Enzyme design. Structure first.
Site, PDB file in Angstrom:
ATOM      1  N   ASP A   1      30.572  82.341  32.658  1.00 24.12           N
ATOM      2  CA  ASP A   1      29.456  82.942  33.313  1.00 24.12           C
ATOM      3  C   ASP A   1      29.685  83.392  34.725  1.00 24.12           C
ATOM      4  O   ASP A   1      29.661  82.548  35.616  1.00 24.12           O
ATOM      5  CB  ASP A   1      28.355  81.879  33.305  1.00 24.12           C
ATOM      6  N   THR A   2      29.794  84.706  34.926  1.00 21.42           N
ATOM      7  CA  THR A   2      29.937  85.299  36.241  1.00 21.42           C
ATOM      8  C   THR A   2      28.621  85.224  37.106  1.00 21.42           C
ATOM      9  O   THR A   2      28.684  85.275  38.347  1.00 21.42           O
ATOM     10  CB  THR A   2      30.454  86.759  36.099  1.00 21.42           C
ATOM     11  N   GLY A   3      27.472  84.932  36.492  1.00 19.95           N
ATOM     12  CA  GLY A   3      26.233  84.823  37.257  1.00 19.95           C
ATOM     13  C   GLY A   3      25.824  83.403  37.629  1.00 19.95           C
ATOM     14  O   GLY A   3      24.672  83.142  37.955  1.00 19.95           O
TER      15      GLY A   3
HETATM   16  C1  0Q4 Z   1      27.465  76.762  44.867  1.00 18.74           C
HETATM   17  C2  0Q4 Z   1      26.276  75.848  45.089  1.00 18.74           C
HETATM   18  C3  0Q4 Z   1      25.224  76.554  45.984  1.00 18.74           C
HETATM   19  C4  0Q4 Z   1      23.845  76.648  45.296  1.00 18.74           C
HETATM   20  C5  0Q4 Z   1      23.945  76.287  43.822  1.00 18.74           C
HETATM   21  N1  0Q4 Z   1      23.553  77.418  42.951  1.00 18.74           N
HETATM   22  C6  0Q4 Z   1      22.330  77.637  42.437  1.00 18.74           C
HETATM   23  O1  0Q4 Z   1      21.254  76.984  42.709  1.00 18.74           O
HETATM   24  C7  0Q4 Z   1      22.315  78.865  41.562  1.00 18.74           C
HETATM   25  C8  0Q4 Z   1      21.488  79.958  42.209  1.00 18.74           C
HETATM   26  N2  0Q4 Z   1      22.004  78.776  40.121  1.00 18.74           N
HETATM   27  C9  0Q4 Z   1      22.782  79.458  39.303  1.00 18.74           C
HETATM   28  O2  0Q4 Z   1      23.851  79.891  39.695  1.00 18.74           O
HETATM   29  C10 0Q4 Z   1      22.468  79.495  37.845  1.00 18.74           C
HETATM   30  C11 0Q4 Z   1      23.396  78.553  37.195  1.00 18.74           C
HETATM   31  C12 0Q4 Z   1      23.180  77.140  37.623  1.00 18.74           C
HETATM   32  C13 0Q4 Z   1      24.028  76.719  38.819  1.00 18.74           C
HETATM   33  O3  0Q4 Z   1      24.473  77.542  39.657  1.00 18.74           O
HETATM   34  O4  0Q4 Z   1      24.264  75.506  38.905  1.00 18.74           O
HETATM   35  N3  0Q4 Z   1      22.683  80.867  37.332  1.00 18.74           N
HETATM   36  C14 0Q4 Z   1      21.841  81.383  36.448  1.00 18.74           C
HETATM   37  O5  0Q4 Z   1      20.923  80.686  36.000  1.00 18.74           O
HETATM   38  C15 0Q4 Z   1      22.053  82.838  35.869  1.00 18.74           C
HETATM   39  C16 0Q4 Z   1      21.045  83.837  36.459  1.00 18.74           C
HETATM   40  C17 0Q4 Z   1      20.921  83.761  37.961  1.00 18.74           C
HETATM   41  C18 0Q4 Z   1      21.933  84.212  38.773  1.00 18.74           C
HETATM   42  C19 0Q4 Z   1      21.915  83.992  40.162  1.00 18.74           C
HETATM   43  C20 0Q4 Z   1      20.850  83.310  40.735  1.00 18.74           C
HETATM   44  C21 0Q4 Z   1      19.820  82.870  39.916  1.00 18.74           C
HETATM   45  C22 0Q4 Z   1      19.862  83.101  38.536  1.00 18.74           C
HETATM   46  N4  0Q4 Z   1      21.754  82.714  34.429  1.00 18.74           N
HETATM   47  C23 0Q4 Z   1      22.537  82.003  33.593  1.00 18.74           C
HETATM   48  C24 0Q4 Z   1      22.074  81.891  32.141  1.00 18.74           C
HETATM   49  C25 0Q4 Z   1      23.123  81.296  31.239  1.00 18.74           C
HETATM   50  C26 0Q4 Z   1      22.776  81.315  29.731  1.00 18.74           C
HETATM   51  C27 0Q4 Z   1      23.827  80.585  28.905  1.00 18.74           C
HETATM   52  C28 0Q4 Z   1      21.435  80.735  29.423  1.00 18.74           C
HETATM   53  N5  0Q4 Z   1      21.552  83.087  31.516  1.00 18.74           N
HETATM   54  C29 0Q4 Z   1      20.260  83.416  31.557  1.00 18.74           C
HETATM   55  O6  0Q4 Z   1      19.444  82.740  32.198  1.00 18.74           O
HETATM   56  C30 0Q4 Z   1      19.826  84.722  30.776  1.00 18.74           C
HETATM   57  N6  0Q4 Z   1      19.114  84.414  29.535  1.00 18.74           N
HETATM   58  C31 0Q4 Z   1      19.647  84.465  28.323  1.00 18.74           C
HETATM   59  O7  0Q4 Z   1      20.813  84.724  28.139  1.00 18.74           O
HETATM   60  C32 0Q4 Z   1      18.700  84.140  27.155  1.00 18.74           C
HETATM   61  N7  0Q4 Z   1      18.852  84.946  25.890  1.00 18.74           N
HETATM   62  C33 0Q4 Z   1      18.724  82.626  26.837  1.00 18.74           C
HETATM   63  C34 0Q4 Z   1      17.376  82.061  26.239  1.00 18.74           C
HETATM   64  C35 0Q4 Z   1      17.170  80.548  26.545  1.00 18.74           C
HETATM   65  N8  0Q4 Z   1      17.799  79.606  25.601  1.00 18.74           N
HETATM   66  C36 0Q4 Z   1      19.107  79.336  25.564  1.00 18.74           C
HETATM   67  N9  0Q4 Z   1      19.964  79.949  26.405  1.00 18.74           N
HETATM   68  N10 0Q4 Z   1      19.562  78.398  24.734  1.00 18.74           N
HETATM   69  C37 0Q4 Z   1      18.925  85.658  31.607  1.00 18.74           C
HETATM   70  C38 0Q4 Z   1      19.666  86.127  32.871  1.00 18.74           C
HETATM   71  C39 0Q4 Z   1      18.454  86.902  30.734  1.00 18.74           C
HETATM   72  C40 0Q4 Z   1      23.383  74.879  43.594  1.00 18.74           C
HETATM   73  N11 0Q4 Z   1      23.959  73.878  44.099  1.00 18.74           N
HETATM   74  O8  0Q4 Z   1      22.365  74.777  42.889  1.00 18.74           O
END
Ligand code: 0Q4
Lengths: 99, 99
Positions: free
Chosen positions: B25-27
């Site tokens: 996951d690049t996002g």
């Molecule tokens: C480096 C640390 C600094 C801050 C750090 N990062 C975060 O808080 C960040 C913003 N969160 C994220 O990076 C999270 C991943 C969790 C994580 O990082 O731990 N990323 C994400 O959640 C990214 C979207 C996003 C990007 C950037 C910002 C916000 C949101 N989505 C990831 C996710 C993965 C997938 C397997 C479900 N995909 C989705 O959410 C997509 N949805 C789908 O693909 C649906 N069909 C799924 C249905 C639900 N059911 C299921 N999956 N079983 C949507 C974009 C259409 C932290 N500590 O928390």
């Protein structure tokens, strides 16, 4: 381009008339765009993620031209924290992931 | 490997001596694994995604192998729909987005 993952993969896409900054998400099946009144017909749809689901409207056949690579397809519109560019469109501009 | 995005980028990872699928996951900035017993000391955390926030146990510097490549870094463990390999590890196994 060969984008590195050190920073978040942000780019500027072009939807409707506006230019925006979306996130190339390899883990997003669909493309979800921040609210913006794209003319057209639509339909209600729920999308989920880490944390739960959000409600969005589906738009089909939208042209988005992610940095000179125009794709055309279905874009979901709703209160999303980041403009997200998913696979239904990454596949169209021939984006691969290589390690 | 050069992975295309017509299908969800699932890959096999051995974590804690256990094999498991994980999406590339690049996002995602970090790596979240579904509930499991990892040795080590955990520090609670909260991460959020397209749904909202979740609580995750934090493990520091865990050795994990993604499709044979190895990485050693932070792995968050909690109630995630699918395991996910984010940027903190993607860059360790020299992964890039190409198009
Ligand atoms: C480096 C640390 C600094 C801050 C750090 N990062 C975060 O808080 C960040 C913003 N969160 C994220 O990076 C999270 C991943 C969790 C994580 O990082 O731990 N990323 C994400 O959640 C990214 C979207 C996003 C990007 C950037 C910002 C916000 C949101 N989505 C990831 C996710 C993965 C997938 C397997 C479900 N995909 C989705 O959410 C997509 N949805 C789908 O693909 C649906 N069909 C799924 C249905 C639900 N059911 C299921 N999956 N079983 C949507 C974009 C259409 C932290 N500590 O928390």
């Amino acid at each position: 381009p060969q984008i590195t993952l050190w920073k978040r993969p942000l780019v500027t896409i072009k939807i409707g008339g506006q230019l925006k900054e979306a996130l190339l998400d390899t883990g997003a099946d669909d493309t979800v765009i921040e609210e913006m009144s794209l003319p057209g017909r639509w339909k209600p749809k729920m999308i989920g993620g880490i944390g739960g689901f959000i409600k969005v409207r589906q738009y089909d056949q939208i042209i988005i031209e992610i940095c000179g690579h125009k794709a055309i397809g279905t874009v979901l519109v709703g209160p999303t924290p980041v403009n997200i560019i998913g696979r239904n469109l990454l596949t169209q501009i021939g984006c691969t992931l290589n390690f």
